[PDB]
Amino acid sequence: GKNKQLRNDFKLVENILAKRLLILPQEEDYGFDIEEKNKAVVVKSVQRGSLAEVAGLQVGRKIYSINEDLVFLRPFSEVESILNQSFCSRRPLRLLVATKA
Amino acid sequence: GKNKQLRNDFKLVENILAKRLLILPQEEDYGFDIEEKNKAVVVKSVQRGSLAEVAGLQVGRKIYSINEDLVFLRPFSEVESILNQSFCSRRPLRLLVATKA
């Protein structure tokens, strides 16, 4: 039932379909850029040598949540503001990112 | 925290990354075949005109769970036995299947 589905979906996401990354703020951003593809947000670029690369963030992967707020429920423009806001506040950035297909 | 992650992972799986299908048993099986690709189980073939096709099962998609038992935790051989066993018992087959990339 619903309870088993909750447990299964956690196991599936956390272990197979995605991983949790943490990136500290750098000079002007978190060392990466995002773009929209289909209705999903994906990493557009990662700055070579940055803490984003160090953290394991790879170009072309979907970002499923930023600080445990799901991305698919929001317009792309709100997701960019969330990222910019997080940066202006110099907080650690927590991401759930897709693993490889 | 963990509780938000549980809620988010459910929303993500149920709404974005997968769908739940139900297939009734037919003559000799459920109208489809499976194979292993990477470490994942995928649909190898769907019988044209079958209840599997009717149900919306598509060739090449991953099957993430069969009757709410996760596939990735098991060897492929156990997954085949689970399917065969389900069929011999003539039970409805419930699948969580990947949506399109």
Contacts of A98 (CB under 8 A, 6+ apart): A17, A18, A61, A62, A63, A64
Domains annotated for chain A, with CATH where assigned, are 18-101 (2.30.42.10)
How far CA A53 is from CA of A21, A84, B33, in Å, comes to 11, 19, 40
CA distance A72 to A65: 8
What region does B45 belong to: left with phi over 0, alpha with psi -120 to 50, or beta? beta
| Cβ-based burial of A14 (10 A; exposed 0-12, middle 13-18, buried ≥19) | middle
Which residues fall within 8 angstroms of residue B97, CB to CB, at 6 or more apart?
A: B18, B19, B20, B21, B43, B57, B58, B61, B62, B63, B64
DSSP summary character for residue A62: B
Chain A nearest CA to B28, separation (Å):
28
- Cβ atoms of A52 and A59 within 8 Å: the answer is no
Cβ(B25)–Cβ(B90) below 8 Å: yes
- Residues of chain B contacting residue A13, judged by C-beta atoms under 8 Å apart: 9, 12-13, 17
Nearest-CA distance B83 → chain A (Å): 19
How many Cα atoms sit within 13 Å of B73 on the Cβ side? 9
**Nearest residue to B21 via CA among B100, B99, B93:** B93
φ, ψ dihedrals at B62, nearest 5°: -75, 150
Angle at B55 between CA B87 and CA B33, to 5 degrees: 45
User: Long-range contacts: A32-40, Cβ < 8 Å, 24+?
Assistant: A32/A57, A34/A63, A34/A79, A34/A80, A34/A83, A36/A76, A39/A72, A40/A71, A40/A72
Q: Is B67 left (phi over 0), alpha (psi -120 to 50) or beta?
A: left
**Residue whose pair of structure tokens reads 């194979």 in the numeric block:** B35
User: Resolution in A, one decimal?
Assistant: 2.3
Nearby residues of A18 by Cβ (< 8 Å), 6 or more positions away: A64, A96, A97, A98, A99
Cβ contact A8–B101 (<8 Å): no
Experimental method: X-ray
DSSP state of B25: -
* Token couple for A26: 């750098």
Tokens of A22: 């943490």
- In one-letter notation, the amino acid at residue A56 is G
CB A12 to CB B101 under 8 A?
no
